[model samples]
Target: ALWQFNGMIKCKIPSSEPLLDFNNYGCYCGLGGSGTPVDDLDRCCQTHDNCYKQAKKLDSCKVLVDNPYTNNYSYSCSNNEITCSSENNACEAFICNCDRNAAICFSKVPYNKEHKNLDKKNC
Candidate 1:
């Protein structure tokens, strides 16, 4: 398709409503959720959400799009191909760190509805 996953990675706060939740992209990767946070994992994801925002803000990483005349979705599924200038490596690392840390958080916690007390516990 064409930079297929951009729809997920970046987001805009729509309609001037401050409560829009990109973390609703959720405890899963790449976004999901309502404004309400469901668990600590969700909180972890919220941190991740902000990390991505920072990544873009700093230009450490560049999210590319297919040229309008040509079609390319080469790196949509994985970001390995995104290149960064030497100084931009700071924000470049920010993007990956966010993903890596969220994965570690998920590993430490299980997503379960049964354990209300523990699931709600902070990560």
Candidate 2:
């Protein structure tokens, strides 16, 4: 096919299939979208630890503490102040990982059905 442009036209044609599915990726784009800088879960792990200096450099991550008690090994991360996240006592039993602006709290208490309320929400 041949086409002519009178003034100006911009086009971006891919020669090969992109690794990421554009449709699925597009569905995640929006304000308050699940679009997180944390690209991959494996890579996201780094942001949680060795923060302060490291977190400052990581554009897609902050920091966090992981609760080891949970069977799923669940944890939470917030964009709030690192100091606040660091100050959390729930970390005493748990481990902390973070960058500069984010953090997660985790503990190795092992998940138990009886301890389902281990989340900080109750605390």
Candidate 3:
């Protein structure tokens, strides 16, 4: 059985055409948890057999057959190829791939942790 998850890139424009921005390519590679999402594009050029074999060696890689997210699922997949700071958009990810055995940490702190307006009245 194969499993897939959607990928969302920051500051990306959603496709005007329906189903154009959807991607389904991943395998479960974690223990008792959802593993890292793998993109087929990373292994699209290689033979399926080779990809499967290589991915098996990695604890974080899972091999799966068939692509998911083909239905009326709306998703976002963006690759920020350009370093555009002029756009004034901040990119953030709740989770990120970290080195194994390293202390897992939050990719970013939650927004508005100061609690300054907790008891404020309406404007």
Best-fitting candidate, scored by TM-score: 1
Worst 10 residues of 3 by lDDT: 98-107
lDDT of 3 by residue, 37-115 (tens): 2333212212232333443454333232212111111223335221212332111110111110011111111212232
Pairs in clash, predicted candidate 3 = none
The candidates, ranked best first by TM-score, are: 1, 3, 2
Q: Per-model C-alpha lDDT, please?
A: 0.39, 0.23, 0.22
What would the per-residue lDDT of candidate 2 be over residues 2-100, giving only the tens digit for each residue? Answer: 011100011111231212211122212111223232233212222333332343344322243322222111223233222223443443213223321
Give me candidate 3's TM-score against the actual structure.
0.18
Q: Which stretches of candidate 2 lie over 4 Å from their true place?
A: 1-41, 46-67, 70-79, 84-94, 98-123
Q: What is the lDDT of residue 112 in candidate 3?
A: 28
Q: How close is candidate 1 to the true structure, as a TM-score?
A: 0.44
lDDT of 1 by residue, 11-95 (tens): 2211212123222233333333335445676666666667655656553244432121122222222332332223423443455
Clashes of each: 8, 22, 0
Write the candidate numbers in order of decreasing lDDT. Answer: 1, 2, 3
lDDT of 1: 0.39
Error of 3 at 5 (Å): 4.2
